[PDB]
Amino acid sequence: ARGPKKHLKRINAPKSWMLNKLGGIWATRPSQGPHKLRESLPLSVLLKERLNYALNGRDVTLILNDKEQNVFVDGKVRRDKGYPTGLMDVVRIEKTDQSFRILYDTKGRFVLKSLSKEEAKYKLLKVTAKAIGPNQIPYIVTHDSRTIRFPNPEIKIGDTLKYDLVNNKIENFAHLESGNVCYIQQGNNIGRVGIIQHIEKHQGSFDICHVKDAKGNAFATRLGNIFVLGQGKKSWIELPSGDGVRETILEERKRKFSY
Amino acid sequence: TIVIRTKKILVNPLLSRRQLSLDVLHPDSPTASKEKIREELAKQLKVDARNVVVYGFSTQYGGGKSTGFALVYDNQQYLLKYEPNYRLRKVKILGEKPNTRRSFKELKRKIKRTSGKAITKLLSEKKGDTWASVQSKKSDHLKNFVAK
RNA sequence: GUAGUCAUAUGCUUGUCUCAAAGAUUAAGCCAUGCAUGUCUAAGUAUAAGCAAUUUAUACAGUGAAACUGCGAAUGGCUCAUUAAAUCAGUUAUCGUUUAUUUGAUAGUUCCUUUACUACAUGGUAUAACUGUGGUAAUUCUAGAGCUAAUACAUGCUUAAAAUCUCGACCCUUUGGAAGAGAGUAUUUAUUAGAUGAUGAUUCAUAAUAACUUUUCGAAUCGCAUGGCCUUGUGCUGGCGAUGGUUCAUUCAAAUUUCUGCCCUAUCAACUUUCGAUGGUAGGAUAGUGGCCUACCAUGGUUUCAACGGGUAACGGGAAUAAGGGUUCGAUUCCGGAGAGGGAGCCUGAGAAACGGCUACCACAUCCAAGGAAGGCAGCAGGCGCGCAAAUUACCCAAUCCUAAUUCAGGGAGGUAGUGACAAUAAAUAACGAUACAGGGCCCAUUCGGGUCUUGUAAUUGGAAUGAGUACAAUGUAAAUACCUUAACGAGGUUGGA
Known part of the structure; x- marks a missing residue:
């Protein structure tokens, strides 16, 4: 192909953005950042269609360009129409001191969870890779594309850390092993939260995992899609749509219109 | 007369404003004039009229209700x-919207074919309406206006 | 037979309502006419009132002219013309390959000349732009004159001594004191790591390690934030970003890549080997995998499960519900290779087999004071043509998307129209009623019988029927926003038979 793509089509932009089909023809294309294209929510989407603080396109252009700084992502200022806010992030709306979790539904739509000045401090990080680099030093990396220097050594590659944004400090981690709580970042099963049952590795190039939860449903997904929302039953963050558990179309009806 | 019900309202401290849905009830008279709607609203909110801007309206197929x-x-x-x-020229504060397209396309014509020497001169002739100009005019409405 | 054709067939032509289609279809007929990827500050360059426009920062205000910049301009968009090929689908990580983009991170060992290191009260240039002097049938022409920049060339000791790294006695407890313990990287190999990260995995790393590499590296940034520190000038204080570099993975990628699948055909039997048909190997290219080639040889092996092979103009093909049914989608190909006179070579670069960069060549193919000096719009429209086949060279970038430099650049996106049975729909547009007056009716199959009985007023009543204009804002093309939807203000005239 000519070179590298550079736009994005209304029609082609993820169902996670709950986008306007009739809308236009395009859609703000996520900027190369911390999260992958599909797994992200560009700010313009976050304020216009989400919060609804903005509206028309120029509305954003003001907000992120205005010399006041109205948007914060993980304790930092952002002024990019399409910064890819990803899973388990913390976004603050300066002018109102609003704090949000970037989390998927139970139906897989990006949801905004309101946090208390309390959780707004800690953010959950999942461990990408772990190896030693320059001059005998250990480095850990998080999905959030965080690069960590001198990390606690009791941390295996597929771990989950709790991060104190305020001090850029770590605390209480927890690997994925039979008996923990987890969130699935993507898949025919995303947005779910349950107890890890067991992890059968097949090495041939793809390991799998099982899970249980509230109504004790059986879940199946690939490791790469498991995010440890916590150690031993206690979750670490407040979940959207009540608990991370979806209902039969049948259970939804009976709960709402009670059929 | 009319009866307005305010419907869906958000609070945007960012742009410092509150956005709301309006549902005008005119059972009898025809669609309400933005102008008249502007004041019956400002009264219910108790805010200066010119600080309240109303846009976009409809009128259910003959029934006296407009959203x-x-x-x-x-x-x-x-x-x-x-x-x-564009909302400003509408309150008759900014003014005109002269036909830029044609000439701008024609200057591109000349300029693209000259060396700096003349270019500067040409530029001293491209249909007015600078942004620098838009501001000075915006500014004048600023000082010269005070009240409520 | 029957007529009808719920056949057309086109062949005749009429209120209010719109989800709203229209030279891919021929030839992959091209550029009439219309037309056209450049750009911004906290941010890099502007005149001590000859960019200069103010105005009085004031040693460098804005303020911008122009330039310098520095960016994209490898994006698309139209084009199968090819193509029976992995094209393409899945289906490969790539121990085999490259990587802007984006972050994240981030970098003490550069002397140590035998510190006039000079001394960094951070270098040198170079230039425009710029004033000008010009030329010429005439250039994106250009000449010669001068200028000046600089986030650009070109640099460049990092002191104030014994630099700074790296042991640590020791106490001396902390301020740790620590003695005296010892001393950077792109580019090479070459060993050693690696027992003491990792893989199935490693000659993996990331180690070193020396060497030895016309080879790097390494903010002569600017921006506000300069008030705290002591000093009192000082030393700082740099804050914070802007402006960099660094490598890694950070998405960016691609780029491979297994693993299922084009039409028929055995009347395809056989195929493929001079350099590749194979293996395997030396190298070399390749940026980097590869017979890809240099060789060098292996003879390979493919194959009736038809292989060689043949033949199918072949450019080419995603959603979801759903007892049952209800239904439907993405939207005229999701997908996805090959063209932008011929040829050639070349171009950018992170990043092109660069269409829309060249050249030069050919060709066309053009202007002309004679001389020279053009020019390839299946990204549009347009006239020819073609000639099967379809709306103005509308409105806006109102969105929502685009690019994009610190803003609100620019968006031939998109949108909005119109046109437009286009396919059209809709299917709703003079009747409601006052009276008189009354001939007798008027119909039958009727032949005569029968039926019985309003029917004309070219008579006199009905509401301030209604239509059409007028602010009316407007879902509203922030402008279509008076054209919508209002609202009202007003306001009825085929046949046959004399």
């Missing part, structure tokens, strides 16, 4: 910085 959206800005000095250039 619309409006804006409440706190400082007309904010309202003046945020609102679109």
Whole structure:
């Protein structure tokens, strides 16, 4: 192909953005950042269609360009129409001191969870890779594309850390092993939260995992899609749509219109 | 007369304003004039009329009900910085919207074919309406206006 | 037979309502006419009132002219013309390959000349732009004159001594004191790591390690934030970003890549090997995998499960519900290779087999004071043509998307129209009623019988029927926003038979 793509089509932009089909023809294309294209929510989407603080396109252009700084992502200022806010992030709306979790539904739509000045401090990080680099030093990396220097050594590659944004400090981690709580970042099963049952590795190039939860449903997904929302039953963050558990179309009806 | 019910309202401290849905009830008279709707609203909110801008309306297939959206800005000095250039000429504050296209396309013509020497000169002839100009005019509405 | 054709067939032509289609279809007929990827500050360059426009920062205000910049301009968009090929689908990580983009991170060992290191009260240039002097049938022409920049060339000791790294006695407890313990990287190999990260995995790393590499590296940034520190000038204080570099993975990628699948055909039997048909190997290219080639040889092996092979103009093909049914989608190909006179070579670069960069060549193919000096719009429209086949060279970038430099650049996106049975729909547009007056009716199959009985007023009543204009804002093309939807203000005239 000519070179590298550079736009994005209304029609082609993820169902996670709950986008306007009739809308236009395009859609703000996520900027190369911390999260992958599909797994992200560009700010313009976050304020216009989400919060609804903005509206028309120029509305954003003001907000992120205005010399006041109205948007914060993980304790930092952002002024990019399409910064890819990803899973388990913390976004603050300066002018109102609003704090949000970037989390998927139970139906897989990006949801905004309101946090208390309390959780707004800690953010959950999942461990990408772990190896030693320059001059005998250990480095850990998080999905959030965080690069960590001198990390606690009791941390295996597929771990989950709790991060104190305020001090850029770590605390209480927890690997994925039979008996923990987890969130699935993507898949025919995303947005779910349950107890890890067991992890059968097949090495041939793809390991799998099982899970249980509230109504004790059986879940199946690939490791790469498991995010440890916590150690031993206690979750670490407040979940959207009540608990991370979806209902039969049948259970939804009976709960709402009670059929 | 009319009866307005305010419907869906958000609070945007960012652009410093509140956005709301409006549902005008005119069972008898025809669609309400934005102008008249502007004041019956400002009264219910108890805010200066010119700090309240109403846009977009409809009218259910003959039934005396019209839906619309409006804006409440706190400082007309904010309202003046945020609102679109087109909403301003509408309140007769900014003014005209002269036909740029044609000439701009023609200057491109000449300039693209000259060396700096003349270019500068040409530029001293491209249909007015600078942004620098838009501001001075915005500014004048600023000082010269005060009240409520 | 029957007529009808619920056949057309086109062949005749009429209120209010719109989800709203229209030279891919021929030839992959091209550029009439219309037309056209450049750009911004906290941010890099502007005149001590000859960019200069103010105005009085004031040693460098804005303020911009112009330039310098520095960016994209490898994006698309139209084009199968090819193509029976992995094209393409899945289906490969790539121990085999490259990587802007984006972050994240981030970098003490550069002397140690035998510190006039000079001394960094951070270098040198170079230039425009710029004033000008010009030329010429005439250039994106250009000449010669001068200028000046600089986030650009070109640099460049990092002191104030014994630099700074790296042991640590020791106490001396902390301020740790620590003695005296010892001393950077792109580019090479070459060993050693690696027992003491990792893989199935490693000659993996990331180690070193020396060497030895016309080879790097390494903010002569600017921006506000300069008030705290002591000093009192000082030393700082740099804050914070802007402006960099660094490598890694950070998405960016691609780029491979297994693993299922084009039409028929055995009347395809056989195929493929001079350099590749194979293996395997030396190298070399390749940026980097590869017979890809240099060789060098292996004879390979493919194959009736038809292989060689043949033949199918072949450019080419995603959603979801759903007892049952209800239904439907993405939207005229999701997908996805090959063209932008011929040829050639070349171009950018992170990043092109660069269409829309060249050249030069050919060709066309053009202007002309004679001389020279053009020019390839299946990204549009347009006239020819073609000639099967379809709306103005509308409105806006109102969105929502685009690019994009610190803003609100620019968006031939998109949108909005119109046109437009286009396919059209809709299917709703003079009747409601006052009276008189009354001939007798008027119909039958009727032949005569029968039926019985309003029917004309070219008579006199009905509401301030209603239509059409007028602010009316407007879902509203922030402008279509008076054209919508209002609202009202007003306001009825085929046949046959004399």
